[PDB]
Amino acid sequence: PGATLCLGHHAVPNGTIVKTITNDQIEVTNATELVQNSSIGEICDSPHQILDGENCTLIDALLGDPQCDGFQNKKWDLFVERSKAYSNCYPYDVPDYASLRSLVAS
Amino acid sequence: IGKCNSECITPNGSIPNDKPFQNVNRITYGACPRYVKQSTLKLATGMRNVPE
Amino acid sequence: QVQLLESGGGVVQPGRSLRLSCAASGFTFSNYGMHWVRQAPGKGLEWVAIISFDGSKKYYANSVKGRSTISRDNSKNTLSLQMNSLGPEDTALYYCAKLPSPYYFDSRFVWVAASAFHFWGQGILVTVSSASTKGPSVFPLAPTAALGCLVKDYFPEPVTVSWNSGALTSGVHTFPAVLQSSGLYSLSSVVTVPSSSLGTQTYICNVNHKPSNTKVDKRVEPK
Amino acid sequence: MLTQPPSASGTPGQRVTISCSGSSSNIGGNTVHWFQQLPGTAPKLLIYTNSLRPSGVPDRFSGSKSGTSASLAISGLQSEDEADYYCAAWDDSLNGQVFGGGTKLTVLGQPKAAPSVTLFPPSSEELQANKATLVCLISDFYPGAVTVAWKADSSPVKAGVETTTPSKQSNNKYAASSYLSLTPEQWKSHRSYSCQVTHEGSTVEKTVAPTEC
Amino acid sequence: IENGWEGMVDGWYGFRHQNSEGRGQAADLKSTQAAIDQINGKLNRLIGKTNEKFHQIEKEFSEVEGRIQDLEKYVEDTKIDLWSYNAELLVALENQHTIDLTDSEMNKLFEKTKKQLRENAEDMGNGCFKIYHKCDNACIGSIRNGTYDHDVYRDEALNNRFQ
Amino acid sequence: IENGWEGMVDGWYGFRHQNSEGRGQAADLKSTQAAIDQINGKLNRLIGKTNEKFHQIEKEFSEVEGRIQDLEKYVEDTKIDLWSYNAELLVALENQHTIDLTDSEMNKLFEKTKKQLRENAEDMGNGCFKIYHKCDNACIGSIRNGTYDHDVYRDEALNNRFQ
Amino acid sequence: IENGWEGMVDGWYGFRHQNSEGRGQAADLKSTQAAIDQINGKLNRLIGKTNEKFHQIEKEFSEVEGRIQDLEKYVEDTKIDLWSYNAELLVALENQHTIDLTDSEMNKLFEKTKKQLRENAEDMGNGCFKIYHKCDNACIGSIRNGTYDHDVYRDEALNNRFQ
Ligand SMILES: *[C@@H]1O[C@H](CO)[C@@H](O[C@@H]2O[C@H](CO)[C@@H](O[C@@H]3O[C@H](CO)[C@@H](O)[C@H](O)[C@@H]3O)[C@H](O)[C@H]2NC(C)=O)[C@H](O)[C@H]1NC(C)=O
Ligand SMILES: *[C@@H]1O[C@H](CO)[C@@H](O[C@@H]2O[C@H](CO)[C@@H](O)[C@H](O)[C@H]2NC(C)=O)[C@H](O)[C@H]1NC(C)=O
């Protein structure tokens, strides 16, 4: 007599839910995440050069606080200012601290 | 300070520079994705799924 | 928001008929189709009936088909339900509610909206049994510390418990209803107060049973 | 009439999903909706049109519908979401709104299970007409499953009397009471009795002493 | 269609057939290839395209500055809000485009097949065709492979389609 | 279609028919429901979703400040222009989507009906079908309600369609 | 279609025909007009709509300022990046819309023609119809001009289409 022939598209048991214009939520076969939220917790030492500034804010390295001597004449691409840093020398204050810090950083 | 290779640096650590967006922190250095407020934005990679 | 008053609760002897009436205000009753849903005590949600915004379309549940009726009045802003031939499987709480439904049950004006008007009313309790509605009996029980009041011997369920004219809201434990081989109900209400509050301050419990005209108060302390 | 599993469970912030399955008649042909019933209160409308939340509802709830399968996800699940959850939808064949079985979810209760067990004796005016009602309370415990051994001079019964409360709105801790009542001819002099507990939030069973008074 | 076929794991779009010499399933290739190329191009546009930004303004504060702090915070918050809106819109648009192109490829295959067998078969409506002649698995192959000659079976079909 | 039907006030998409036993009009339901759900979801996304912003920078000025004033004004004007562009684009896009989905639902209903009566009727072209048999109002009901059995009238139609 | 027709320079969409009285080519008009109007509206929206901006902040620097310089540079760079993203997205979207409307007009003309000759011709599949009767150039004119009366040739076609 005659035969039959169906047209179809595959599916999966466990898809993922996404957002579109029509449906705020709609299921699909697979979807990749575009919002990075996982942090590995540590700063990779490459390819940018790094200066740890262990106990020394950039200003104390500039003026040359006696503990901040390992930084003399050093270069860097990123300076990591620690929250534990301090100053163990003669007191002082800097008019427009942030400005000097930013220009020395750049 | 680790010993690895990542081009995007945040105060929360290094992060990978492939996903176009990021939520870790608004403070970036390097080839970093743009920070948004969204916690997750998912992009479909396959047709509508209606199982049997 | 919207304010409704619900009438027609109580105890209907088996095989007899009920009459519930939900009357609301604060919104446009004329636009929204309404629902009657019922919930058997214990657990479960069973839908009952639905009526449109004019009365054109009225639809009923298969479990009550042919023995119930729904109605509405738009000049009085009132929704009402009738049901005859009642049995123990019908005793329940009855909610009058605007549920999401197919659009034609709502007015032309409120098909499209961003808010999607919705509301449920409190339950209307109807119970079927031999109507021996009697007054409760309250006994205080007492010796970290813990004290309570036990109220038994009441058939109509809507019992409320307050403490010292309603001030203690902490640690208050209200216990679920209990049904036995008899037809009476029992219910205790307790509170755990640490063991340094005997002479500091002593308490009194209050039992309010509305469908018996009962207000019974009693002090709590050890023997 | 709608396959909705009986129980769900999770931990604060675990994004638990509640499923619902219907037929080609109801869900495949019409949108769905979801209600939440907090104890002693009417159901509030959580979700409608399978993804939509009304004015009052947070964004923590999400939903979806695929053919004859509806899903209700709770992302930021927390202490005050322990309730009953109902899936419902409109069916054309019956021309009516068919509900779901129902679901009760619990959360991570740190299984410390510290009960405030106390024994409550029937007072005088209770026994004024040969009516004794002795009660035993076990309050503020999470795990649920328990058993009460009514040791009336270590003598059991074959009857049912209990009252199980739901989770606390804040601390997620169940509680229970057990009360048994009889006549003075059975309790004229009150020799001795007590209530043991066999709940698995501890090591072994424990009791107290309700002697005569 | 009423649902999808789970047993298909060598393709995304497929034919299922039931003739007198058995039932069978075979996936179409070039439709899946054309649907994979577009998603890969979408990803190549999206992933890995990140630009460098070295020295920016400060965005956290431990001292009450007054006015300049207000300005800096306002700038950063404005940028963040705008970029988040752009991100949400971009993701939604690209997902709608993915869905649209997948549906389009399915319907395109369906119409291609329908136009192959001009009058020898009928549109049942459910994503299945009713063939009106004896069609062995080689005939179905000639259907999918594109070399179906309609003039051969034509008359037969018409007879069994009208008498 | 050539125009719309104004007399339809219990739906958005409808059938009109003229058989020997009169003329009639009846609106299709589920198409209208599916077109209302999408617009309601659009609105729910749009309306009522507004975020809080408490302390901002100043944006009006009664004193010639110099440079910082320039900067603040520039920031605010930039934000305003960008948000206005985003708003215009969003509104235009959502309106095009509304139009598209409405047209899609109409054409979907039309194709559903066309595929119901396989060969028993013909496509006149103007959004009306030509039935080729006697079809009482119960037959039209079985059309709209979805329970039209084509095999019943089939042969009749073919006769009146070819001879 | 397999390709495009280069010899058509009085229109964008056209018919080509080969009957016993020769081969010919003639372009459809109103489809091209409707495709030109939309592109002209697109351009009128795009071109010539530029707003004025008179006094802005400085954006080049010959002196190391410190903090305010950082802020100004950050503001300008942010605005530039955002506007560039908006521009790329706008251009891509409008080009996709152009392509979509052109394809839609072609397919709309095709379906209009197909619905004119109901059963007198067949869908070969390659963007060409198979006419099943003798059709002089006046008959083809009545096709394109819209005044083709199908009932005239109908029976003839069916004979040559089935016997
Ligand atoms: C950055 O600063 C921290 C804290 O100021 C430094 O940690 C210090 O480490 C020294 C080791 O050299 C600790 O010395 C201690 O000496 C006593 C005897 O006097 C001994 O009993 C201890 O076991 C320890 O060795 C010192 O306590 C510690 N500082 C503090 C405040 O606890 C760190 O070394 C600095 N890093 C650099 C690179 O300068
Ligand atoms: C479905 O897409 C996911 C993306 O979310 C794929 O999973 C990732 O694949 C990359 C590529 O190797 C891995 O680096 C990631 O670790 C994967 N992430 C996760 C969460 O699995 C997944 O492979 C895709 N599945 C299929 C069948 O294509």
Author numbering:
A (entry chain A): 9 to 114
B (entry chain A): 274 to 325
C (entry chain H): 1 to 52, 52A, 53 to 82, 82A, 82B, 82C, 83 to 100, 100A, ...
D (entry chain L): 3 to 9, 11 to 27, 27A, 27B, 28 to 95, 95A, 95B, 96 to 106, ...
E (entry chain B), F (entry chain B), G (entry chain B): 10 to 172
Task: Quote what the paper states about this structure.
HA is synthesized in an inactive form (HA0) and then processed by intracellular proteases to an active state, which consists of an apical globular head domain (HA1) responsible for mediating receptor binding and a stem domain (HA2) that harbors the fusion machinery. HA1 and HA2 are linked by a single disulfide bond and assemble as trimers of heterodimers. Stem-directed bnAbs prevent the release of viral contents into the host cell by locking HA in a prefusion state, thus inhibiting the structural rearrangement necessary to fuse to the host endosomal membrane. We recently reported on the discovery and in vivo efficacy of the VH3-30-derived bnAb 3I1427.
